[PDB]
């Protein structure tokens, strides 16, 4: 639903990660590929090694899209519509994979910002990631 406290928790946390967002995107992908091998299947054209330039560069793209979402919490469907077509129509990503990546994104944030990672902040971010995943899979429903 995304309530005022939620939005506040999301904006505040993103403000903290700031210039590190891109790095976090790359790290979260690494965590996803290592923890859930089935996900590597969507990136056959990638050198899926650990500090790879391709993984790092893609992580920056993912982090940028999330930053755009943070700026448009009121209209996620509008802000992410192009990405919705890409994921549903062209890539045909299994919905289950979004949960796996979302989990690794939370772990990455927990690792780097333990102090702001309170139970309330954890619940707001999970709501945020679940909201983004829903929009990126909306063409299936």
């Amino acid at each position: 639903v995304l309530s005022p406290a939620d939005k506040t928790n999301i904006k505040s946390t993103w403000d903290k990660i700031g210039g590190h967002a891109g790095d976090y995107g790359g790290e979260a992908l690494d965590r996803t590929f290592q923890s859930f091998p089935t996900t590597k299947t969507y990136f056959p054209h990638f050198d899926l090694s650990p500090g790879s330039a391709q993984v790092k560069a893609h992580g920056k793209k993912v982090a940028d899209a999330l930053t755009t979402a943070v700026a448009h919490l009121d209209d996620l469907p509008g802000a992410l519509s192009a990405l919705s077509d890409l994921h549903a129509y062209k890539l045909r990503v299994d919905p289950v994979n979004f949960k796996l990546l979302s989990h690794c994104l939370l772990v990455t944030l927990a690792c780097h910002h333990p102090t702001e990672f309170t139970p309330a902040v954890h619940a707001s971010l999970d709501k945020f990631f679940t909201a983004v995943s829903t929009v990126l899979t909306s063409k299936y429903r």
Binding site: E27, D30, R31, Q34, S35, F36, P50, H103, C104, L106, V107, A110, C111, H112, P114, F117, P119, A120, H122, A123, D126
Partner: protein
């Protein structure tokens, strides 16, 4: 569960620094907060309504310590998680009727709690080893449904 030699080392190495009196309560508390429907199973625990009510709830801290100790048991018996959790499998399925999907959710928030506590030491490599253990425990507990 596989857990190649190196993974075993990464897993047990970090577990030795885990404060079992803290982590269990923190993981159960967050499960109740992040996934609200799980509160239905803990009606006997008193006030859960707010995040701080959950975090200061004595029964939550006490039960969490018990859940954590059974995990410690599974870690010693990695070979035969199935037998180690057979009795608990019957409980959660038979008497509790907890859908297995929730075992996976608790496993994942435990991973978040470890990351929150260890920071950098909880590398992608360490997480991967723990993701295998947590999936293993969830599966051993869901055995009574298979």
């Amino acid at each position: 569960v596989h857990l190649t030699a190196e993974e075993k080392s990464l897993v047990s190495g970090l577990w030795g620094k885990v404060n079992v009196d803290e982590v269990g309560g923190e993981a159960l508390g967050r499960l109740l907060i992040v996934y609200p429907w799980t509160q239905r199973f803990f009606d006997s625990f008193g006030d859960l309504s707010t995040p701080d009510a959950v975090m200061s709830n004595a029964k939550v801290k006490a039960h969490g310590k018990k859940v954590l100790n059974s995990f410690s048991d599974g870690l010693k018996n990695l070979d035969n998680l199935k037998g180690t959790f057979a009795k608990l499998s019957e409980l959660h399925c038979d008497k509790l009727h907890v859908d297995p999907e929730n075992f996976k959710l608790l496993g994942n928030v435990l991973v978040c709690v470890l990351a929150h506590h260890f920071g950098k030491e909880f590398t992608p490599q360490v997480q991967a080893a723990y993701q295998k253990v947590v999936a293993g425990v969830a599966n051993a507990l869901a055995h009574k449904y298979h």
